[PDB]
Amino acid sequence: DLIYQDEHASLQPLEGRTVAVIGYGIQGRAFAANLRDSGVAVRVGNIDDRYFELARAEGHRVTNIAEAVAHADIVLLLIPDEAHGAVFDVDIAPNLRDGALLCVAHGHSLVQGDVRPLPGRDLAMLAPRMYGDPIRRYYLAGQGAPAYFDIVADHTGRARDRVLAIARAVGFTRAGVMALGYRQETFLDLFQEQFLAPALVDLVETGFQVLVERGFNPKAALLEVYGSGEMGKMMLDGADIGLDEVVALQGSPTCQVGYHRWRGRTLPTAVRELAARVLDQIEGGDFSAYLKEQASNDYASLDDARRAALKRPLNVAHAQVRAAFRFPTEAAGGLYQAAQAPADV
Amino acid sequence: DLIYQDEHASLQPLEGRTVAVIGYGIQGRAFAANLRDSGVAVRVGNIDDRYFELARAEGHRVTNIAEAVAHADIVLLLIPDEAHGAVFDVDIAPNLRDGALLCVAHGHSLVQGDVRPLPGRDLAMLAPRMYGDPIRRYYLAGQGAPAYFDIVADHTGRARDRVLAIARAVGFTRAGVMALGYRQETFLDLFQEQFLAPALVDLVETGFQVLVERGFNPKAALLEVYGSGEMGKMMLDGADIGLDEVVALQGSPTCQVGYHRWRGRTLPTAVRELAARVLDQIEGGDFSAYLKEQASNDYASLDDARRAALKRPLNVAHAQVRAAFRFPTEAAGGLYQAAQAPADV
Ligand SMILES: NC(=O)c1ccc[n+]([C@@H]2O[C@H](COP(=O)([O-])OP(=O)(O)OC[C@H]3O[C@@H](n4cnc5c(N)ncnc54)[C@H](O)[C@@H]3O)[C@@H](O)[C@H]2O)c1
Ligand SMILES: NC(=O)c1ccc[n+]([C@@H]2O[C@H](COP(=O)([O-])OP(=O)(O)OC[C@H]3O[C@@H](n4cnc5c(N)ncnc54)[C@H](O)[C@@H]3O)[C@@H](O)[C@H]2O)c1
Ligand SMILES: [Mg+2]
Ligand SMILES: [Mg+2]
Ligand SMILES: [Mg+2]
Ligand SMILES: [Mg+2]
């Protein structure tokens, strides 16, 4: 495995270069803020929507996508994957300078052939293993999350150095940036989002629903299954030292005995078989067809699903718990500004 | 629901009083450190083992359990639940002063009748919804985790004020301290440890095993299922704003569409039915019998299970990942000392 940390990547390839962050959403905002705070010349390219004014409000040089690309040495395409094809064809390909680098943060558009190599220009993937807020929060703490990278086309011979320079400036090399094919990254990423994340929340919800049906205080039930932050803490501490190890070190003997009675015995074959089906639907292109269909609207069915989700007993109970119990939040005040808001006492 | 935050609980009931922390383990150490830093007079009562010298090393007045109880107004029994009966009968009951308060952090010993009310003395439960390290780390950040409390016996009329004074000093009232019966707390707590925690780790492991069997990079597979910290971050951010809400706010449209394709559809009836069985085994006293049997040895079978757990593919892969990727850790240097170690650069 090829893994780069801070000492394996220089900022020198970005000196006197301009990085165009295309999009100012979940990833675009975090990339833009970290690049700027790392002393990189950054511009934002964005369509005429709320994100354009947000980028301006947070002190960035903002223009349409075409002008940003045309005045950039490195272009980071940080907009939704189903929009890549149209923006690549219309905005990026006609304006990408000779010897410039285009990066995606997900391999989907590469697998589908919506983003393709261009003569005289570099193409790469730099895919964070983390969402926007934590990438920004970690960065401010001198930390970072891992990333996968893939050099798809290196026409200049500088593609790797520039990608790893972006990675260090955004903070991914503080954890590690591992070489992984865009195809494998695509399937990995989609599998986490389609099998693991839903199954994980479904499980928490099953815990809540059984407790409430059996007459347990709904606030207490919600708190134990995730609301307290304890299961989230176990998973984040587990990420560091191992999940079984967290229980061995911080579980009472009563907890450890209970845990190890059921550890490896809880799930039937049907869960493992569902994981295989999700993966086949991802690899076979069934999901890709489903996604394109959902993106045919402005994600109308997704909007309905999000709304319906919040009416579920678990999310009704959550609102009641979070109203009654204060949570240890890190204030988001000017998190993506050059200077953050005064600390909230 | 009766929930106390900082403004509903005074430190005044602890002024000129001594708190004996019995045990200096996962909970005992966090209680002792927070109480001291909150300006409470704290002593440690502990048997002649490694925890005794650790308490002394961290600057505490440490004696045997009998002497600590005898010189205390409030006694916190923070040792394993199966040891409560013998320590109550031998060390606590004969030495508990007139008008003194005994607190447990779990209702198990109360349900089993191993800890019982005593004439002229107060009995209560103050059960944190969090393990030791995070209680201490939250406290240092001016934060806290929730707790459940139950006044089992109030012979003085001061039991509630003293319990909630302990809760505020240790930091639980920064989130909220909710009245909940020791019995219900017992079953809730055991259910989280026996159904949810194992099922959660089993699920993560199922994700890892299917990916590795299907030819995915084992480091990448491990990172996606928890190793990156992303799923842990989703769960901890989810604790605050809701699990579905985290995906709605920080998920890409591709992620959100994938998530909502499978959300509420991933688990068969068998999982829900297993949750019911675990709960019946807890409520019926089957687990209690199993626990007493495991505690008959010095938890010998648990030691074997912990050792075996670390040899599993997931934990072998974890060691390889954590060697190759740096994780954003909060340094544990003198975390439980009056003054913490110099910040690790
Ligand atoms: N560990 C947690 O995260 C947690 C959370 C909530 C509730 N609790 C409750 O808190 C209590 C303490 O659990 P813990 O996890 O801190 O335990 P632990 O395993 O860390 O306990 C070790 C401590 O107990 C003492 N001890 C062990 N066996 C003893 C014995 N036979 N006689 C006397 N002292 C003995 C040791 O000297 C040491 O001080 C239990 O009632 C538990 O259910 C623990
Ligand atoms: N969100 C994450 O946590 C995350 C993590 C890793 C990878 N990624 C990848 O990063 C990329 C960005 O995802 P995101 O989550 O930041 O997205 P997002 O949903 O926040 O994207 C919103 C942004 O995209 C722009 N945009 C939306 N539709 C557009 C269109 N039709 N034409 C032009 N611009 C348009 C908006 O103007 C705004 O700037 C995707 O390739 C995604 O797969 C995201
Ligand atoms: Mg991802
Ligand atoms: Mg417990
Ligand atoms: Mg507990
Ligand atoms: Mg994704």
B176 and B194: one domain?
no
Token duo for residue B68: 């600590």
Q: Scanning every residue of chain A, which has its alpha carbon at the shortest distance from the alpha carbon of B213?
A: A276
Is B106 annotated as catalytic?
yes
Distance CA B109, CA B22 (A): 15
Residue A169's closest CA among A195, A144, A141? A144
Is A58 annotated as belonging to a binding site?
no
Side chain identity at residue B64, one-letter code: N
Distance CA A93, CA A105 (A): 18
B142 and B206: one domain?
no
A248-281 burial, b at 16+ Cβ within 10 Å, e below that, comes to bbbbbbbbbbbbbbbbbebbeeebeebbeebbeb
Q: Which of A180, A198, A224 is the last residue of a domain?
A: A180
Is A67 annotated as belonging to a binding site?
no
A58 touches chain B (CB under 8 A): no
Supply φ then ψ for residue A38, to 5 degrees.
-90, 0
Q: How does DSSP assign A75-91, residue by residue?
A: EEE-S-GGGHHHHIIII
Q: Write the Ramachandran bin of A23: left for phi over 0, alpha for psi from -120 to 50, otherwise beta.
A: left
B212 touches chain A (CB under 8 A): no
B258 and B213: one domain?
yes
Q: Which of B180, B198, B221 is the last residue of a domain?
A: B180
Distance CA A216, CA A94 (A): 62
DSSP class of A227:
I
Rounded to the nearest whole angstrom, what is the distance from the C-alpha of residue A257 to the centroid of ligand 5? 13
Token duo for residue B250: 């920080």
Number of domains into which chain A is organized: 2
Domain that holds residue B256: 181-345
B211 and B278: one domain?
yes
The residue whose CA has the least distance to atom 7 of ligand 2 is A105
Distance CA B126, CA B67 (A): 23
B154 and B201: one domain?
no
Distance CA B250, CA A50 (A): 16
B240 and B281: one domain?
yes
B17 and B65: one domain?
yes
User: B125: which chain A residues are within 8 Å (Cβ-Cβ)?
Assistant: none
B105 and B142: one domain?
yes
A85 and A187: one domain?
no
Q: How does DSSP assign B187-227, residue by residue?
A: HHHHHIIIIIHHHHHHHHHHHHHHHHHTT--HHHHHIIIII
Q: Which of A130, A146, A180 is the last residue of a domain?
A: A180
Cα A33 to Cα A27, A38, A141: the distances in Å are 10, 9, 14
Distance CA A319, CA A131 (A): 23
Q: Scanning every residue of chain B, which has its alpha carbon at the shortest distance from the alpha carbon of A252?
A: B80
> Considering Cα of B257, then B259, then B264, then B269, what sign does the dihedral take?
positive
Instruction: For a ligand 2 pocket test, name from A21, A24, A26, A288 the mutation site with the most ligand atoms within 8 angstroms of its C-beta.
Output: A26
- For residue B254, which atom of ligand 2 is closest to its CA? 43
Closest CB to A207: pick one of B141, B242, B275. Answer: B275
Q: Which ligand is nearest to the CA of A89?
A: 2
Say whether B229 and A145 touch across the interface (CB within 8 A): yes
Q: Scanning every residue of chain A, which has its alpha carbon at the shortest distance from the alpha carbon of B322?
A: A240
The residue whose CA has the least distance to atom 14 of ligand 2 is B252
User: A264: which chain B residues are within 8 Å (Cβ-Cβ)?
Assistant: 198, 202, 205, 312
A82 and A93: one domain?
yes
B121 and B9: one domain?
yes
User: A197: which chain B residues are within 8 Å (Cβ-Cβ)?
Assistant: 231, 234, 247, 255, 259
Supply φ then ψ for residue A74, to 5 degrees.
-130, 130
List the determination method. Answer: X-ray
Distance CA B2, CA B153 (A): 18
Q: Which ligand is nearest to the CA of B104?
A: 1
Q: Give the resolution to one decimal, in Å.
A: 1.9
A102 and A39: one domain?
yes
Distance CA A122, CA A159 (A): 6
Distance CA B13, CA B167 (A): 12
* Residue of A26, A234, A282 best to disrupt the B interface, most CBs of B under 10 A: A234
Closest CB to B266: pick one of A202, A324, A329. Answer: A202
Q: Write the Ramachandran bin of B330: left for phi over 0, alpha for psi from -120 to 50, otherwise beta.
A: beta
Name the A residues in 258-287 with CB < 8 Å from any B CB: 258-268, 270-272, 274-276, 278-279, 287
